[PDB]
């Protein structure tokens, strides 16, 4: 039962308390506290021979205080390596973190959030015997709900990885494929493309049909089919229909609700009509 | 029963649950933990194959108002841990469930509670356990905090909100507009507010046997100005039409309003409607 | 009355409201909860149909300065819970109200207080209760915190702010500009700063019987350069006009300023105004 | 003695704790940061126009005061001032709040910078019959780690949206000098295209004769002729003998743009442009 | 023995608590994180140019010190240094603040890394008559969950905003090699369009004769002829017999772009491009 160097102040009535006075006239009191994550245990200060290891006994996280995380500090006069390790059986260990400890340089791990039942520190001394060594361990637990004050907006920044030239990198372009007809054997309107944010459409017409006619249609507000014009990729022909195949037609579809590529007629085989819409 | 820890004494021999600090160890601080960091062991009784442990319903209402719960299970054989809630302490619904592998400490998330009663129920798998522990933590309350403004917070986006390392945005807006619906006689009809659109497609349709639609924009003066549209079927460019069952494309960037005026109509009605796009 | 918990004793037999921790259970920590996690039971007296429970006004002013309040109600029949405030402890205004369903634990939000006094008022519905409890939590203060910078925070947007899994953005900017207003004589007028615009629509209008407007841009040197516009009614392209009651569209990408100079005017006045768009 | 009573544990030991868990067999100490505590500074009713002035409070001490907040309640109107001083003699006002009759009025948290703080309350034109003034102070700063499990929901200022959409600026512009007062033929400086799609180039100076040739570079690094469009008359060309003119170029896909002076006599020539995304 | 007095509960038990609730029938312990506590290091007035140096403070202990903050007040100007050492012998300065005469001056929180910390204060050219130096330390880190109910209001750096709009970059660019020093006919590599709208293709090399044919692929996977526009003269074609030239393509809607060398004699040919969104 040893006495320490700090002394508890006494209140007006001579009662001791682990408090500090405050306010102008020192007539109020407050208890200084620290979350247990700010406390450390010294695990060892025994100097190691060259190559010798210190191994903490496995620490069970399960208890009255449920340990969630661990952090370490090592100081030695010669270089070594600190390992933070975990085990579900307190027998076979995996390394969760490892830090090189330079000679005469205090070295800290990060907070390591634990998942297996048992944790330990293992410190392996390098090729020179230590004359001085200390190893400290902090643990934490729990999680507090907080409400962020709404008075001041939070200032945010983006990763160097999310910017370029001091600007946030965005992607505005959307693309989708669509089947108007697949291996059609007879005349029909086929499926209607929903324009939904696209501005541009490329339509390919292809198949075995020996004769076919495709008519290009859009629908606007009334729901009636309206003829539209496309531009053929190979020769820049502009037309509102085609008798050809093995060809592709580009359309400006901004403002339409739907696009229909109707097979007006077909004989002697089948025809597919498919496209890609881009915003 | 006494424990292995010992409270330090101050200079005057007074015990306290404190630690010393500062260079000369002449200051003191009380180590604390929010109650969310504390756990209760609910059971360590090994279960037979398929046997369940069911905690009695825990009332959230009391001097400490329980807001959330978290569990840890460890067993030498596989099982399933359920966190459950009830408003009547009789019929239970499952709020969360976790598979517990053999010999693997398994934790739930924090579960935020809404009904009056909570419990853990653990169902052992097809092999009898030889070792089992189940721990329960609870929390309560909410503290107001003020975030230090010194350094901006670094943020990142869900894998589901990015693509090529770029944030996915949608810049395009579209709206439909009625200039005229089943108009029977000449008039200007309603004026489209351009409001951030750049492009407009106008359909003219109806039973009218004869009609003339004139295309107008308004800029800063408020006076009508003739504008030209492009007909979709043949790329005719004009500032008016005598036709119907047709659609006209306009570049409307810079205009305040667009008007599609029926100059004349006989022998039926006419609708004029469009879609504006940014 | 003694309670069911028992404080552990340290090695020297000293009791403390602590828990042991570390492998050898030779360290101690005091479990705590912010007062926001504590509740008081206000009443458990069953109410008749339509009967109200009204808490006496609670003064926020005292050694603990109450900033916020939250409530929980449980009853076997439906009712309504009100959180109310008063500056005189006599006339009350409702700050929050929640419907409480039969047999469903119901919580208010945290209500941040402004007047001097707060209270709960609970009004039972049309059926007499056989079971009722009403709990009240209060909080106070605000702690400064520093958020760890190690991991960027994950952010998410409201369902309200996305569409199709993309953030809704607005990339278009528009502004109006006066080159000339009711000009009576020749001058350059005001110079439009291009500042992010790509497109410009300019209207020329007024009483002037004769006028000439010349279209200019300035680039890096600051010398005036002739530019060409496209008239909306007939797609005439020109670098000046003798006309009015007309509008001219310009591509202004790359220019620093745009000037619409009145070269000459007789017999009235002339306005020249436009809208610039990105 | 107050109205609260500490509970006793199983062994009859008192503690400032509450029981919890189903069997009430665990204990927890209720706490509050000192920022949630208040001191009543005064309840003495003031005459019309009379002021209450708190003595200067030194922030420096065992508890290092970082911030202060006030609450005032009076049956007549007045004004509460929060003030600071480095010498406890000359005072500057950091905050001021009007206090209406019969309305509890709070300041914000005021973060302090000078050594001493005080409240000063000035009563209005009517004598008070009832008055209380409360003061809370805070201190310190705790390091926290925000849970990474759940994204935070964020929203934008009314000032940063329009029509429910975030306001963005996608356009970038930069100016560039190809040549400045060139006296003799050379390639001049090469514009790095870097995200621009469009370029406007002005050619101007005293040279009596000059020829500028328009070049782009792509992947190979060899110069390739490009065409521009003159602003005044929409001439399209890959070079010019003229000056006091500007040429517009589509530069999407190029790495660099060069405006080479092929020849010049009888003066100097500048060639400068603006590139836009 | 201080001026504050612990209240007594109903049973006359003292406690470091405050009462609360309307009837003052509940109790709470006022607390402060240790970061809110300060130690006075010195109040000894320094002569002109004289320094105060705190003895090195070991961070390692039962409380693991993570950070430190200082406040200085003097009637004459000086400089406060926060310093660190791994050996308690050689010191490096981590932070430094000028302290004006008669102005309370604070450092920021300094997060420590070496084993030992200290304050060193150097007085300026005039002897002090009044001086105090205070030191706060902190430790630990608490896991917190930010309430999901209310969106946070967020703001962007002055550096990321312009005209009240967030600065974004929507344009993406990539280079692509169709052929490099090809010696014989082949299709070469196929460009994946992947979000690009525009493509500039350069054809160059030693080949004395070559033919390149321009192809796109859409949904069927069959090659489709596409037309490009040559930069030097705005020729539009779906193939070329030339080289030392560049061709611009609109590729929106295609899945892949292929630049096929149909034939080549008398040297090699490279075909490379830049695709832009």
UniProtKB/Swiss-Prot annotation, chains B, C:
Transmembrane segments: none annotated. To B.subtilis YqxG/YqdC. Not known; does not seem to be involved in host cell lysis. This is Phage-like element PBSX protein XepA. The lineage of its organism: Bacteria, Bacillati, Bacillota, Bacilli, Bacillales.
């Amino acid at each position: 039962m040893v006495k320490y160097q700090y002394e508890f102040p006494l209140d007006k009535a001579g009662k001791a308390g682990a408090v500090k006075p405050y306010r102008g006239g020192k007539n109020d009191f407050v208890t200084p506290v620290s979350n247990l994550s700010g406390v450390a245990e010294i695990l060892t200060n025994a100097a190691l021979k060259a190559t010798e290891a210190y191994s903490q006994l496995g620490q069970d996280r399960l208890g009255a205080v449920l340990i969630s995380k661990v952090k370490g500090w090592a100081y030695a006069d010669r270089e070594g390596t600190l390992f933070i390790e975990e085990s579900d059986n307190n027998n076979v260990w995996t390394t969760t973190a490892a830090v090189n400890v330079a000679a005469g340089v205090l070295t800290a791990t990060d907070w390591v959030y634990l998942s297996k039942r048992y944790y330990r520190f293992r410190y392996v001394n390098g090729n020179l015997q230590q004359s001085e060594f200390v190893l400290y361990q902090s643990v934490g637990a729990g999680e507090m709900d907080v409400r962020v004050n709404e008075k001041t907006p939070l200032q945010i920044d983006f990763a160097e990885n999310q910017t370029h030239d001091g600007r946030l990198k965005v992607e505005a372009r959307k693309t989708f494929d669509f089947v108007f007809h697949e291996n059609a054997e007879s005349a029909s309107e086929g499926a209607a493309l929903p324009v939904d944010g696209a501005a541009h459409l490329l339509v390919e017409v292809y198949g075995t049909a020996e004769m076919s006619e495709v008519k290009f249609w859009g629908k606007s507000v009334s729901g009636q089919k309206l003829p539209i014009r496309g531009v053929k990729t190979d020769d820049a022909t502009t037309a509102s229909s085609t008798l050809g195949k093995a060809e592709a037609w580009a359309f400006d579809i901004k403002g339409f609700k739907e696009i229909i590529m109707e097979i007006i007629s077909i004989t002697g085989g089948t025809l597919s009509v498919k496209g890609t819409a881009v915003s």
